[PDB]
Symmetry: D2
Subunit: 214 residues, 4 copies
Amino acid sequence: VAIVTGGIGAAIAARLASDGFTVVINYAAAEEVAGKIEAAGGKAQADVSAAVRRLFATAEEAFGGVDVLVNNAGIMPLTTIAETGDAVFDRVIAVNLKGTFNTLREAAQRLRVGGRIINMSTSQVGLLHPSYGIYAAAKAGVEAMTHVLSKELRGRDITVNAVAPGPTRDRFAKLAPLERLGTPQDIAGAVAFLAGPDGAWVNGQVLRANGGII
Amino acid sequence: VAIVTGGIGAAIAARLASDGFTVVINYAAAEEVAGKIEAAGGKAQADVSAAVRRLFATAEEAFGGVDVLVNNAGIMPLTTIAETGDAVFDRVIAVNLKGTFNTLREAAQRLRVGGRIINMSTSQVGLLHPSYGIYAAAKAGVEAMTHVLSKELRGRDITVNAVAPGPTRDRFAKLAPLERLGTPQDIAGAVAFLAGPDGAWVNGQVLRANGGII
Amino acid sequence: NKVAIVTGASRGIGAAIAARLASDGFTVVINYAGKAAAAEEVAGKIEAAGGKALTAQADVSDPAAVRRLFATAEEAFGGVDVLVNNAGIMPLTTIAETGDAVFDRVIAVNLKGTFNTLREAAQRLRVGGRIINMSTSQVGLLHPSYGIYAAAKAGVEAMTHVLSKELRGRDITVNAVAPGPTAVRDRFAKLAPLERLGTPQDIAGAVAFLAGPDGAWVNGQVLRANGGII
Amino acid sequence: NKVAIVTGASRGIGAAIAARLASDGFTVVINYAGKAAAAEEVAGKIEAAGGKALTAQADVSDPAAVRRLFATAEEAFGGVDVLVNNAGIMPLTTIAETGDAVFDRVIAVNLKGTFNTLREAAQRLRVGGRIINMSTSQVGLLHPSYGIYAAAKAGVEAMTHVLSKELRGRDITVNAVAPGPTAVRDRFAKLAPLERLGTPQDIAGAVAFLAGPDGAWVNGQVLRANGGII
């Protein structure tokens, strides 16, 4: 069983579904994704920024515990530092930073052994372009928490890893040395790997999925 | 002229004073530091988490603008992720993350050309030990903002750089390959370098000052 | 139809990468440098399980030897799709105690050897190709006595990034897998948070994935398969 | 009383590091590898300004040549306190277009040469010593054609970190300075946020500081002096 907060988020839920995960989709479309997942032979609102507890109980109710979580839930306004309102700011923090922290806090306590946790960052943390400051600053915090979390979860056979996709007219396709555009499927594949059996030994890492932009 | 938010913070103010900076010390002892600075031939409360504006006007008042800022102001409780209250959390964020952001927001607008900005991180961002999660997560955000800020300040001949000291009984002295303990003077020296003429070309960097622990 | 060269593939991690690539369906060229026995064992096993493999002796620090390897594989099976640089050596010496032969050796095998295959691959690898370099987690850990090994492997990582950009326009990815230690014992078993010893197959996992369909978008990357240690 | 060896110190950055160290008060050994003229110029200038310098030819890829250098300096002035590894070369080739001589050369000079002085320094550097390796910002940038240069320099960075730990107990720091490009022109002048071209003296600044009193606590570090470019 896998909870999936937060396109990319859809792809992820679907893929895990295909893989064999009962996916507790999470919004704050959702039906749509759930319908396809069931139509396809596969098998909950909450603002990640309290609710987070109900969300976990929700599923331990239905399926009897959680084995995987994927913190896709995030928002990305784009302001320079000089022109960033306290409102723009605390929101970006609340959603991305606190949200993750919140679910990580719960996952910290609930998750079954053999588990997998996979946060969603951004190759902008590395690229640190103008106006991605706040966004990058926020996701940066997530990366650090991914690292610390993984050692903090010692002895409970759980892994914590992040995934920083890149962008996902044509010049943006030619940005990657691969000279095409990232698909939400590309990222889902990455996530699928960590949550898969081939990702069992990868732990406390930031996997950039960007087709070679950095 | 240099503003210095936030031991280490004292050392910094003093050193810049010695160097020749009118230092607008900032608390939320301060006199003490100011007295010594004047006693020594050298020459403002605000919670960095609005106040930040008064603080800048305060000095543009007295001395007619600001040339340097040093975001030492920070707090460091130490909780694992599982055991971290919403109160512990948002505070660590507010002080470290928002505080810096706040002063950076102001510095973004005010600072004279030829300026220097120097945020205070922590080699724990790299070491990511248990319970430094939130602290590291917070300072991480600062590092990213340091990077983005520096490119965002293009054309205004200002530099943005951070400084991540390490710790500053005897086993902690023997932690560094140098086998002694960090002094608040050590860190001040680093900061002094960036704000000095020898730091004019260093820009958008995280200088770890830890005696070789990482 | 798909063909992979695996360098240093006679034992442990390399053997496991070879077995897994074969299992994925790659015809696997098992490259070794010394006695051929172990490598034959790996080939046999791949065969007994319904895969295709060929063994090929060649010392990777040797530019000509390396060219033969690629040619032998194109001869036999019509081209190369995947390259895996596992060959390496890891004598441990502090910098102060490193003799010239030791320094030169670590460099030749680890850096020049991988460079040799990298250069060849850039010329011959089929479009849609995947290249996985083996690094080490010591590039981050950086413990005493690992300085020469890590310097070489750090160089490999740099080449990994730059090559992926140089290969623009050919749909070839280039990544590396940085393994931690694989197979006081409890202490080393519990070294990682997962508190178990990592395995040849764990690493074969990340490789299989980078070469796989679930990796297509990953390149220019160092992927550490160490189990949470750094 | 304090003595610094500066390697590759006849021009540009190396000259500026030499002049500055002299100005700080170090007796500076100006190490060059080719014709001695420029290096003599640097020595003269240091002299005319009230400093002490000595020039010393030696090719750093040569372990023996390197040992002579350190011995010449201990002979003359009684020991070594500071080592600065500026010698290097930077031919640009894509990996696919790198000949063996080019590869081997970049490695010998940049990696082996710096290793040679590193090994020597570990044996002879006086306590309280400072060692600064010159890297490059390309270790991060990693542009096409810079793959061999960056691999070598990445290796230097790895050695920098590991050596600082290996030198535990002797109060010797080890760091590196990674310069960006120093001296379409407006485009390159405006390459950095500061939007001016960086200078030999800018780099001499970060070096002077790492060797200085305001650096004592810094080690195991790569310090990029590129002007905000990465």
